[PDB]
Design a protein around this ligand. Structure first.
Ligand SMILES: NCCNS(=O)(=O)c1ccc(Cl)c2ccncc12
Ligand code: NI
Length: 329
């Protein structure tokens, strides 16, 4: 169930990057976007290899270049290919090598105040980094699409017994009821907030659409990195800021770290109506995405196991749902 194989990746790497890899293992996942990851090692340097297919090939590297250019070291820059490129397109898939980084992500590695400040500084460097007109005309933009809200509302009349349902699809069906009220409150609120917000395409900055503890690699002491730049966007800073104290992953939910963060980001003016909105909409979408996954055709077997898992966590103590409803500064 793995694309390339042993000596095959090695041959690929050596052909397009002129690197001599002796070992090249396959990793079970990482950040799935039709992208498999491998840890290829050279006589002295380890590399993180990524192969993209379907919802993979795009143009986000237009940002990491813009960001590297802007001078943000807290980003993992791609290894150039012999044709002097940052990737290697191959009829079937795309190759994107990175220097390998061993560093627990934020879900198993907390940040030191210092690091919390450093993150705040970077998120700011980024939020400030000017975006070329030609780049803006690409980046998706905050529209407040009810896409997600609507998909969730669909489920409502779809929760009931149907022998055509197995164990898993069942627990979910039930967990959904058991929390029926809370969920409607997320849709009806995300919607309500949606109306109270007067858009302003001028206060929109470059944002890492989904910057949670899962995408901060916490290294030695300054070696923090903000990974996953597949779907960056242009939105009010609150699109990113909502994660600080947001509780995603059941971490990043300790009020005192928020202070540390704004220290580096430099305390400014945050729209709490917008901040609150994102915390709600995000959960909606998650419910939407996970929902579909657990309703329809059990064809997505071995996946739906996790969807359900994450789905439930959202409701655990001091997790994203608790925090959203506890609308605090
Ligand atoms: N996360 C612990 C250490 N390495 S890793 O496989 O998870 C990993 C995940 C995601 C990205 Cl983008 C990477 C980039 C470079 N090295 C390791 C990377
Ligand atoms: Ni550099």
């Amino acid at each position: 169930k793995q694309p390339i194989q042993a000596q095959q990746l090695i041959e690929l790497l050596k052909v397009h990057y002129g690197i001599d890899i002796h070992t090249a293992q396959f990793i079970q996942g990482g950040a799935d976007t039709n992208a498999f990851a491998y840890q290829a090692d050279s006589e002295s340097k380890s590399y993180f290899i990524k192969l993209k297919y379907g919802y993979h090939d795009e143009i986000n590297l237009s940002i990491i270049r813009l960001l590297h250019d802007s001078g943000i070291k807290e980003i993992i820059f791609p290894i150039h290919t012999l044709e002097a490129k940052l990737f290697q397109q191959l009829k079937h898939f795309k190759i994107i090598a990175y220097p390998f980084i061993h560093a627990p992500n934020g879900f198993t590695q907390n940040l030191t105040g210092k690091q919390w400040k450093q993150l705040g500084k970077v998120l700011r460097q980024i939020h400030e980094t000017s975006v070329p007109i030609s780049i803006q005309q690409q980046l998706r933009k905050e529209i407040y699409s009810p896409k997600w809200r609507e998909i969730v509302r669909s489920f409502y009349n779809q929760i009931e017994f149907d022998n055509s349902d197995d164990k898993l699809t069942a627990a979910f069906k039930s967990f959904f009821n058991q929390n029926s009220a809370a969920i409607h409150r997320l849709v009806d609120t995300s919607e309500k907030l949606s109306k109270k917000i007067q858009p302003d395409l001028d206060k929109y900055v470059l944002c890492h659409s989904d910057i949670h503890a899962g995408n901060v690699l916490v290294g030695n002491e300054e070696s923090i990195y903000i990974i996953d730049w597949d779907e960056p966007m242009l939105a009010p800073k609150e699109r990113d800021l909502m994660f600080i104290g947001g509780g995603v992953g059941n971490v990043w939910n300790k009020p005192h770290e928020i202070q540390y963060f704004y220290e580096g980001y430099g305390e400014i003016n945050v729209d709490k109506t917008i901040l609150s909105y994102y915390r709600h909409e995000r959960i909606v979408e998650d419910i939407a995405v996970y929902g579909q996954d657990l309703l329809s055709r059990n064809q997505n077997n071995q996946s739906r196991l996790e969807s359900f898992k994450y789905f439930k966590e959202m409701f655990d103590p001091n997790n994203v749902v608790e925090i959203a409803f506890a609308t605090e500064q």
